[PDB]
Amino acid sequence: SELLVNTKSGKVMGTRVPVLSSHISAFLGIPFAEPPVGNMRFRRPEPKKPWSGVWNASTYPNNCQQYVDEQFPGFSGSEMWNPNREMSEDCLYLNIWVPSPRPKSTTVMVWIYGGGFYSGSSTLDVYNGKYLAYTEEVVLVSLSYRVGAFGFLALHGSQEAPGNVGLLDQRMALQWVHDNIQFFGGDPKTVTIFGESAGGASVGMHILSPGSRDLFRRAILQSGSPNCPWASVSVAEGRRRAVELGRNLNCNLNSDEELIHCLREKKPQELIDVEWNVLPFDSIFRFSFVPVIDGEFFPTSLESMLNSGNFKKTQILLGVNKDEGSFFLLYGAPGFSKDSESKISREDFMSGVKLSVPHANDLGLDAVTLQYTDWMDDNNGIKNRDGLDDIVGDHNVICPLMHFVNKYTKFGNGTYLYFFNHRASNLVWPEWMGVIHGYEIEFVFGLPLVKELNYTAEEEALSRRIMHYWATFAKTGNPNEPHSQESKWPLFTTKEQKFIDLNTEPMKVHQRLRVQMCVFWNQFLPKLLNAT
Amino acid sequence: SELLVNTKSGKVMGTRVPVLSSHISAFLGIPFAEPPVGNMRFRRPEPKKPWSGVWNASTYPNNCQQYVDEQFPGFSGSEMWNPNREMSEDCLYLNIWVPSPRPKSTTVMVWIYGGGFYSGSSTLDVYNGKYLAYTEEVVLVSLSYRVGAFGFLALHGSQEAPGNVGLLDQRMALQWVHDNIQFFGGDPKTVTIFGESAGGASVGMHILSPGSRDLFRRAILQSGSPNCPWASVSVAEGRRRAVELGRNLNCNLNSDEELIHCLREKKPQELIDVEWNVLPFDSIFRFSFVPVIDGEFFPTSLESMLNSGNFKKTQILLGVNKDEGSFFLLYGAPGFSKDSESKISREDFMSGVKLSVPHANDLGLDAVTLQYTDWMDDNNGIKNRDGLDDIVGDHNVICPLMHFVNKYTKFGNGTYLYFFNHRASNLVWPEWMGVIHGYEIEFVFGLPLVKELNYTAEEEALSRRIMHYWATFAKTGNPNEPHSQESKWPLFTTKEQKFIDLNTEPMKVHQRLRVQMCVFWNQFLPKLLNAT
Ligand SMILES: *[C@@H]1O[C@H](CO)[C@@H](O)[C@H](O)[C@H]1NC(C)=O
Ligand SMILES: *[C@@H]1O[C@H](CO)[C@@H](O)[C@H](O)[C@H]1NC(C)=O
Ligand SMILES: *[C@@H]1O[C@H](CO)[C@@H](O)[C@H](O)[C@H]1NC(C)=O
Ligand SMILES: *[C@@H]1O[C@H](CO)[C@@H](O)[C@H](O)[C@H]1NC(C)=O
């Protein structure tokens, strides 16, 4: 039976699902780890004990326990990102969409969801892999991993809550794919991991980490890179936050054992309820429990790994969206609202940059302000708003990614860079937010091919072209069709540093993506903060 | 006799001089101080002892002892600035051009020459006052003052070489004008002092200094302001340079008395020959002997005087040229030559900014570099050249002047700001230098009205219009004709900060002259250098 697959962990039974007036198979909720519950909370995951009988994989698994956005109740713009399944600590499962008839050995793509390491689900509608599996004939996998304290509480030295367990969850799922995807018709030698934001940073982290490098072939990073300022913390900061989490729950803080034991008796929601109280600064785009530079998963600091070429050498395709910061200003900066144009006064601008670069002294705050202020028209509310939008985007996503790509390209086997700047015609978020963080995903997953969703014809064409770039790159290491007649997405090189825009207009090649601003964020400001 | 004038110092005999096919009187070489020779060198000037008989004022006086530019022998571009008279320490004289017939009580304008405080002459061809006196019917005076060590050697505490004596020379000449210009038909109650560069900074210094404020009515500053980085030094730095001058001449350095006595036995050329060896840094646009913040001529630091309104409150008219820095890069920055386009490589750019901001640490040098580098086209030789040109101009002239004007305007009775950007059609200097430092002077003095000089008709029209702005401002405190039909030069206000361009095209009003760059030079960099 096409819906029955025998894996090394036991038999699995899928379900036939319709897609663009055809059908493919879907194996949903396949367990790849023992449930990380009870005394296993904060612990490294354990391999799923094989099972007898047939595992029913016809429905989506639970979503991991996570903070839930309630800023705009009933608003689809924000709720499409929330868990659409019951939450549970028993959440380590993966989903596979397989073309029909079942391929013998085709390209595999494993999606790693984003969500700032504190949220995210593999079951969201924008992550439905059927359109991509079907349209590009690839075996599409979406994995899951613990987020929040459950996935990243870090007390270095302790083996009970070592930190990074959420990354190890991803690695185990990549191990299961490496070990079993052949039975679903996928080529374990041709798997591409791809993800957005924290998912994009995770992808980069698996490229860096010696222990994950052999489990995949190529990588795609969307609006995230491993060296992002919000993507990791030192073991000292991780410890300080775990202890502070404990203090918020009236825990005994005499020892890691006492703290860990106390945290394990608390119900999930108790940890989620005080999660945000541990941040060291009043900030925006900073999350409580994220990966820690532990000396294990990451042998040394990310920067020295990038400088010495200590990472997997392969091809990568990555990029960013035009207005990466608007989401975070809307949720946490004074003066921004969902229903107004959000014109920003100098006062709110100043408050905004303080929130955006939490770790900066006054001189640093001044350098940023000068760098983004048009002093010939300083009280212009639109410029202040857009300037703040660029500051958050540049500091948090674009410049860190540009630094990663420039360092990677020196040792890699091929880099393709994009700049996604098409605002979807049916976006429910206000205009001022522009091309929002996370809104290229719907084009990568092919939603614009679904008539009922209301995208234009050019938006379907764009989605088809992006899906074909991603899948062709996954298969060959190059997003371009060998002897095609379409315009070529040029390779990014250390010298020419080319990139393309990704929108409904005719391809246009550019160079040095935001260099002016990134020299400021990557070279000048850090030097300024270190000296002062 | 129209050429005979009886002053409080004695009788003077002028000479009739032709001008644009007419004639006016000229009284040249009138002494206003005792010759500052012998034991008087470095000393405050003394009032000229009255003389019996008639002083022959038909020819130009000697020029003060000064370094002489020999960079381009025979080249008029540079030699027009050199002394065109025999040099001598006996050089304190003034020149007066009087309309004919002799006015009874007209507007007086006193010109103060520039030359970085180390050079300059009242007798240069570009300073010929006959065209302005004749065309605008004003009594035009040009004074002189000691430069170099002779005018500014400073050993604070000593009364033998107190420093600032060159400024006191100017003040004495302004005193003589106040006391005697009535006899030449000038109104001592309506004198405007105006000057360029060091002359412009001197004008501003007389506005600040309590002891000079009552000697004039209004002021005009061209490409110079009192707070310029090269226009003054602390008493400590002045002392350090005087001592170092002494060391270069094998002087006894045990006491000020020993040093001063030794320096007084040396011939003029001996001091001039080692003058440049005392600068503390390898620099450009820095001069050895300049005014010192002594607590006397300047009661307190210039900045606190500007902040508290401690200065003469009146009307001022001032401005800058488009390419103030090219002169100094040509003479001292590697990669610039008179006969080539002077395209600059990154290496020479980096050497240039180091030379341009001598007092900056590495972080400061980086902030400047980032601020003026187009990182999208960093190896562009023209951009590097023009960028260096702007750095020198902004740091040394424009931003210091913009800081002065903004501080002055808060307490003054009227400010008129200009931006002179017309490159003369007959300029002998290369094109890359643009609108050079000091080349608006020829338009202020009316040379374009002299056919043989070869200016276009529009250049004559521009010169006529500038002369009429300067003279009308001198007479009334406003460069505009009351009920004229011509476009109005708007007042510069704290709020709107308006200014005009000065060129052959129709007047065009602008706002916030180079704010972006001046916020960097006036607010950010100083803060950065103080913090680091
Ligand atoms: C698989 O389990 C789900 C759980 O609700 C159920 O809806 C579905 O009918 C089951 N299918 C089979 C064949 O057991
Ligand atoms: C990738 O590696 C192959 C073989 O090592 C080499 O032939 C090719 O030039 C490389 N491509 C790039 C873009 O580095
Ligand atoms: C004034 O003195 C100068 C000095 O050379 C001389 O040329 C001129 O003829 C003299 N005129 C009179 C009237 O003495
Ligand atoms: C200058 O002062 C006069 C009298 O004090 C006043 O009437 C006038 O408004 C002032 N002008 C400016 C521009 O400050």
Curated annotation (Swiss-Prot), chains A, B:
For this protein, what post-translational modification is recorded in UniProt? Answer: An interchain disulfide bond is present in what becomes position 593 of the T isoform.
- Sorted alphabetically, which keywords does the UniProt record give? Cell membrane, Disulfide bond, Glycoprotein, GPI-anchor, Hydrolase, Lipoprotein, Membrane, Neurotransmitter degradation, Serine esterase, Signal, Synapse
* A cellular component term, taken from the record's GO annotations: synapse
List the catalysed reactions. acetylcholine + H2O = choline + acetate + H(+)
Q: Which InterPro entries match?
A: AB_hydrolase_fold (IPR029058), AChE-related_enzymes (IPR050654), Acylcholinesterase_fish/snake (IPR000908), CarbesteraseB (IPR002018), Carboxylesterase_B_AS (IPR019826), Carboxylesterase_B_CS (IPR019819), Cholinesterase (IPR000997)
Q: Quaternary state and partners of this protein?
A: Isoform H form is a homodimer; the asymmetric form is a disulfide-bonded oligomer composed of a collagenic subunit (Q) and a variable number of T catalytic subunits.
Say if the entry is tagged with keyword Secreted: no
Query: Which PROSITE patterns does this entry report, sorted A to Z?
Result: CARBOXYLESTERASE_B_1, CARBOXYLESTERASE_B_2
Question: What positions does UniProt annotate as the active site of this protein?
Answer: 197, 324, 437
Instruction: Supply the name of the protein.
Output: Acetylcholinesterase
Q: Which Gene3D superfamilies match?
A: alpha/beta hydrolase (3.40.50.1820)
- Any Pfam family hit: COesterase
What's the source species for this entry? Tetronarce californica
The record lists its disulfide bonds as: 64-91, 251-262, 399-518
Please verify whether the record's keywords include Cell membrane: yes
Q: List the carbohydrate attachment sites.
A: 56, 413, 454, 530
- SUPFAM superfamilies in the record: alpha/beta-Hydrolases
- Regulation of this protein's activity per its record: Inhibited by substrate concentrations above 0.5 mM.
Q: Name one GO biological process term.
A: acetylcholine catabolic process in synaptic cleft
